[PDB]
Amino acid sequence: SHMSRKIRDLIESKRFQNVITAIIVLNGAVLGLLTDTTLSASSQNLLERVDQLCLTIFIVEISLKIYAYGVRGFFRSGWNLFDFVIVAIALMPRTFRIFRVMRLVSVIPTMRRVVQGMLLALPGVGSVAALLTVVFYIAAVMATNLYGATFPEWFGDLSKSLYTLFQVMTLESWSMGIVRPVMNVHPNAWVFFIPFIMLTTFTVLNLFIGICVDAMAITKEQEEEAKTGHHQEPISQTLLHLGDRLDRIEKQLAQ
Amino acid sequence: SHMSRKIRDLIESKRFQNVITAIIVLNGAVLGLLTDTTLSASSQNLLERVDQLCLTIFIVEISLKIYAYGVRGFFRSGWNLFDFVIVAIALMPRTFRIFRVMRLVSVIPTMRRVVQGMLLALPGVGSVAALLTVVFYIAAVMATNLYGATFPEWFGDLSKSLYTLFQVMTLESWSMGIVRPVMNVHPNAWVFFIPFIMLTTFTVLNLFIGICVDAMAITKEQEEEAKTGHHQEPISQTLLHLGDRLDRIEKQLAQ
Amino acid sequence: SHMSRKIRDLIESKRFQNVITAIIVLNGAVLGLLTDTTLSASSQNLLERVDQLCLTIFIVEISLKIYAYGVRGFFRSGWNLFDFVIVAIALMPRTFRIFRVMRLVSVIPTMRRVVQGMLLALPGVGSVAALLTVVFYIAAVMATNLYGATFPEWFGDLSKSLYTLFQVMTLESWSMGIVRPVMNVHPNAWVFFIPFIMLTTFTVLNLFIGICVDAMAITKEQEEEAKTGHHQEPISQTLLHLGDRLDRIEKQLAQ
Amino acid sequence: SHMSRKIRDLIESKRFQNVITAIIVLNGAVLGLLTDTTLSASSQNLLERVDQLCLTIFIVEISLKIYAYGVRGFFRSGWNLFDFVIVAIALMPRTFRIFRVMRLVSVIPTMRRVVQGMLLALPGVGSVAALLTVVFYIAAVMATNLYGATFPEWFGDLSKSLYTLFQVMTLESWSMGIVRPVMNVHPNAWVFFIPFIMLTTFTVLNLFIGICVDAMAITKEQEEEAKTGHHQEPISQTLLHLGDRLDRIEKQLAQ
Ligand code: NA
Ligand code: NA
Ligand code: NA
């Protein structure tokens, strides 16, 4: 139908994207103003009405998208499902309404590409992240058994130990705050904590560098296909294509 | 005119650059000495006169540049405008006179190239920086609503929350100073702060690596054009040129 | 023998790997539950029996591997020796039974490849690590002689100095906690500590980047050979092979 | 002369290098033992005699090198001058005798190559380091004028300000220790400190990454020439050589 295409072309336009972006910003701005404890009843009611207005615009927007694309369809995209869930959950009387400012990511294509680059880079680091998980679990069980009875606030149970070890890994007051006090009772505690810091800071660095490097490469390809409809072929492929061309030249040289 | 060219050749010489560099250093040295509270009236007046002398040399320098290049002209360069604004603002009776030591960057070509490499690398990271901005805004609104009434010094309002979250992201006393005290009242506060630290430290790393990698590549090209008048062609272009040469050889092989 | 091959094919199957993985997780879960101080005698005895059950499954597993591969043989692999030592040490009545969760690394091939990539990357950074060792030793001897008599808790002996310098390198309370107090007695102490921080943070960064970059390249090759039986040839080799092909074409062009 | 060559071949042997390495380690070990306050007079005198023995072996070693190479000659190498200065200064009755453990670097060729890679990488980062220097100087003058009268311990003079800003850049107690107290008197102090932290942490990262990347590339070339007498040609050169070969093939195709 001509109406489905007329709506699609409007939905897909820069102006419609700019209007929706401006309304997301307006909603974020009113929710930020609503954190103000000193506001009058009238000022609060006014801002709450602007929140309702912003929300209804989003319901019309999603309903226009479910029409112009179909329900099969619109829900085929992960970003449409996210946008749907975020607005639909608000119509169910979850306190943190500000999470709908995340819609800026889904609505802005360049921001959307950064996030999908980061998400697509996550499977490729799962073994490093599992190794980190294993090191933390082992260390938490050790720390609980070793220091729990003497330092219960920091190592009293598994939960307390996982928290303190996360603090230790971030190098936050690890020595003046945690290990120098522990060594007053357990003089060889550094044999546990120094190798733990060495292992975890290294692994967390590796984990983040791995994501950082992969995500940049993925986004760079997605940004190329968004502009030219294709991406740059790997240097190995270009070198392989040159080698195949040299085969035809070597063959033509004989005949 | 011959006079315009005689001045241009002087302005563009190494000696003129060295004299102006020495006067910037002299001005920086006298302003550093003027921070000394224990100085006598005579010593203070002497140094203040050396500041006036340094400033007048800069007015002559800029006036010589506006003459030898034209006003169209001299103002065509962003570094000339910056140099002009920095000296012209001093003739308007803005307390921080030391900001004129930044002129070392504009006056030294290698330092100028490092800074322009850093500035040209900024547009290419805007989506990562916006993502970081969005995460901070969302988190600040959440933190204000969650902990503002119980921890007003740290989360009392949006401003206080943005400051504390910046401190948390830098890992400064995040646990012993902020989160362990918050958990005494809100036992599940780690569900908010640990993912916030994970997200923001990762994003800030990505943002800085992105600038760091792009800026180095840009400066390396600018440093090449400064010396040889051109830069090294990308490996993809060299491989494409080889492929085009193989087309002419394959064509010549048949005929 | 047909029985040796029937067992090998079972040992090498995905199902056997999944069962052993599930039993490692079960053992880790029961040992984590045994850190709980508030557990009843019956609950403790039950979990201790589940630890015995998990351990006996591992003895059967290793015994099946020593049979199907031979003792020459099974012990030819470093991962089999590690798995053997970990289970065999438990049969010698070393308190830290949780270290057997490290078996997840040896049992999961992708996790095994990450760790062997990290280990193979270590010889190539030995000179940077030795340089770091030398800087720490020199600095520890200096710090002991300089500040030991006035600050005995932090620099009293070599051991105390090595610990404080490790804390200083990690930037943990280095100034408010260590150097500002030392400067109250030794005003030029910053001449020692600031260059030490500059040197060691740089070296530790270099050491970790070196491992991080090498380990990723090694694992990427091992992951390729695991799937395709071979890895991608270096760009230098592909370029050398193209050059050798151009020699045959230049030779054929004359004759 | 045959004697000069017989000594050179001994000096250059692995055994002579191992003996000298063992004596450097022995000297380091005795100097580390001499930090012990509780040592008896006899134990101290014994270790002091072992220090004299180690030192005399080094005088014979350097004298053998000045003979076998010549004084022109031996002093032609920067590592020989360093080794000479380190042993010659000990014969002038400078308290820190432990600095002679640095000789391990000059005596071990792989360690020597890491350090020369780091030194050769320093000129190429001078403009980034100068930019950092400029930012620190400007900020120190500002901080002294702004906060010196109200916070004299931290910003009382230029020296105190340079120290506090170095602490701020390392993110050590920057907020709980320095900026939250400063904001109690100067509520907008974050306008100064947050951009300062943003600028300096970024610049120091860039400076260290620059050295780290360049130093690795230089050492890798030096390690290649040490083993094969030459290094791997850049990918740009190999691609340029292939292009030159394609010129001769295109020329031969016509004639
Ligand atoms: Na840190
Ligand atoms: Na810290
Ligand atoms: Na700290």
Mutate one of B35, B115, B133, B197 to test the D interface: name it (highest D CB count within 10 A): B35
Is B143 found in the same domain as B205? yes
Please answer whether residues B23 and B54 qualify as being in contact, where contact means their C-beta atoms are separated by less than 8 angstroms. yes
Is C88 found in the same domain as C16? yes
SS3 category, B70? coil
Experiment used for this model: X-ray
For position C120, which CATH number holds?
Answer: 1.10.287.70
Could you tell me if A241 lies within 8 Å of chain B, comparing CB atoms? yes
Number of domains composing chain A = 2
Rounded distance, CA A97 to CA A33, Å? 13
For position D53, which CATH number holds?
Answer: 1.20.120.350
CA D169 to the chain's CA centroid: 22
Question: DSSP letters of C186-208?
Answer: -TTTHHHHHHHHHHHHHHHHHHH
Query: How many residues are listed for chain B in this entry?
Result: 255
Among B87, B108, B129, the domain-final residue is: B108
CA distance D123 to chain B (A): 12
Among D83, D108, D133, the domain-final residue is: D108
Cβ pair B35:D210 closer than 8 A? no
Rounded distance, CA C114 to CA C220, Å? 9
Rounded distance, CA B155 to CA B146, Å? 9
Burial class (CB in 10 A: 0-12, 13-18, 19+), D221: middle
Please answer whether residues B167 and A170 qualify as being in contact, where contact means their C-beta atoms are separated by less than 8 angstroms. no
Rounded distance, CA C249 to CA B77, Å? 53
Structure tokens at C68: 């199907």
The residue type found at A224 is E
Mutate one of B206, B211, B236 to test the A interface: name it (highest A CB count within 10 A): B206
Residues of B in contact with A248 (CB under 8 A): 250
Separation of CA B185 and ligand 3 centre (Å)? 23
CA distance C245 to chain A (A): 7
Cβ pair B194:A166 closer than 8 A? yes
**Closest Cβ opposite residue D105 in set C134, C144, C254:** C134
**Closest Cβ opposite residue C114 in set A131, A197, A236:** A131
Is B253 found in the same domain as B152? yes
Is C135 found in the same domain as C21? no
Q: How many CB pairs under 8 A join C and D?
A: 103
CA distance C68 to chain A (A): 29
Cβ pair A131:C232 closer than 8 A? no
Is A71 found in the same domain as A145? no
Say which residues have a Cβ less than 8 Å from residue A221's Cβ, sequence separation at least 6: A231, A232
- Nearest one of D152, D157, D146 to D187, comparing CA atoms: D146
Is A156 found in the same domain as A44? no
Is A166 found in the same domain as A80? no
Residues of B in contact with A105 (CB under 8 A): 131, 134
Q: How many CB pairs under 8 A join A and C?
A: 103
Burial class (CB in 10 A: 0-12, 13-18, 19+), C254: exposed
- Nearest one of C147, C128, C127 to C139, comparing CA atoms: C147
- Nearest one of D195, D212, D215, D133 to D166, comparing CA atoms: D133
Is B205 found in the same domain as B144? yes
Is B150 found in the same domain as B46? no
Angle CA A224–B133–A125, to nearest 5: 55
Say which residues have a Cβ less than 8 Å from residue A46's Cβ, sequence separation at least 6: none
C-alpha count within 13 angstroms, C-beta hemisphere, residue B235: 14
Give whole-number Cα distances, B141 to A33, B137, B158, in Å: 9, 6, 6
Alpha helices in C70-178 (DSSP H): 78-90, 103-107, 109-120, 126-147, 152-155, 158-169
Rounded distance, CA C18 to CA C61, Å? 13
Rounded distance, CA D176 to CA D192, Å? 16
Q: What is the largest CA-CA distance in chain C?
A: 92
Is B216 found in the same domain as B150? yes
Angle CA D11–D17–D19, to nearest 5: 110
Structure tokens at D176: 């709980």
Q: Please identify among residues 178-207 of chain A the ones whose CB lies closer than 8 Å to any CB of chain B.
A: none
Residues of A in contact with C25 (CB under 8 A): none
Q: Please identify among residues 42-61 of chain B the ones whose CB lies closer than 8 Å to any CB of chain A.
A: none
Please answer whether residues A174 and A193 qualify as being in contact, where contact means their C-beta atoms are separated by less than 8 angstroms. yes
Could you tell me if C131 lies within 8 Å of chain A, comparing CB atoms? no
Say which residues have a Cβ less than 8 Å from residue B152's Cβ, sequence separation at least 6: B160
For chain A, helix (H) and strand (E) counts, in that order, are 12, 0
**CA-based nearest residue in chain B for residue D184:** B153
Ramachandran quadrant class, D36 (left: phi over 0; alpha: psi -120 to 50; beta: rest)? beta
Cβ pair C158:D245 closer than 8 A? no
N-to-C CA span, chain D: 60
Dihedral sign (CA C7, C11, C14, C15)? positive
Residue A26's φ and ψ, nearest 5 degrees, are: -60, -45
Could you tell me if D210 lies within 8 Å of chain C, comparing CB atoms? no
Angle CA A216–A227–A82, to nearest 5: 65
CA C28 to the chain's CA centroid: 19
Separation of CA C170 and ligand 3 centre (Å)? 10
Say which residues have a Cβ less than 8 Å from residue D212's Cβ, sequence separation at least 6: C202, C205, C206, C209
Rounded distance, CA A213 to CA C220, Å? 14
Resolution value (Å, 1 decimal): 2.6
Alpha helices in chain B (DSSP H): 2-11, 14-33, 41-69, 78-90, 103-107, 109-120, 126-147, 152-155, 158-169, 180-183, 190-228, 235-254
**Closest Cβ opposite residue C172 in set A173, A243, A254:** A173
Say which residues have a Cβ less than 8 Å from residue C142's Cβ, sequence separation at least 6: C192, D96, D98
Q: Position of tokens 């005995």?
A: C152
Cβ pair D127:B111 closer than 8 A? yes
Among D55, D87, D108, the domain-final residue is: D108
SS3 category, C92? coil
Rounded distance, CA A78 to CA B87, Å? 55
CA distance A118 to chain C (A): 18
Residues of D in contact with C125 (CB under 8 A): none
Which helix H or strand E contains A224, and what residues bound it? helix A190-228
Strands (E), chain D: none
Say which residues have a Cβ less than 8 Å from residue D23's Cβ, sequence separation at least 6: D54, D57, D58
| Domain of C230, in residue numbers | 109-255
**Closest Cβ opposite residue A111 in set B127, B140, B246:** B127
The residue type found at A117 is G
Please answer whether residues B208 and A211 qualify as being in contact, where contact means their C-beta atoms are separated by less than 8 angstroms. no
Which helix H or strand E contains A240, and what residues bound it? helix A235-254
Structure tokens at A189: 């505690």
Residues of D in contact with C254 (CB under 8 A): 252
Rounded distance, CA C236 to CA C248, Å? 19
Could you tell me if C115 lies within 8 Å of chain A, comparing CB atoms? yes
Chains with 3+ CB–CB pairs under 8 A to D are: B, C
Is D122 found in the same domain as D92? no
Residues of B in contact with A215 (CB under 8 A): 206
SS3 category, D11? helix
Structure tokens at D109: 């060729």
Chains with 3+ CB–CB pairs under 8 A to B are: A, D
CA distance C78 to chain A (A): 19
**Closest Cβ opposite residue C158 in set D32, D105, D249:** D32
Separation of CA B174 and ligand 2 centre (Å)? 9
Structure tokens at B186: 């809100």
Dihedral sign (CA D44, D49, D52, D54)? negative
Is A89 found in the same domain as A74? yes
CA A91 to the chain's CA centroid: 25
> DSSP class of residue C100?
G
Cβ pair D141:B104 closer than 8 A? no
Rounded distance, CA C64 to CA C8, Å? 9
Separation of CA C139 and ligand 1 centre (Å)? 22
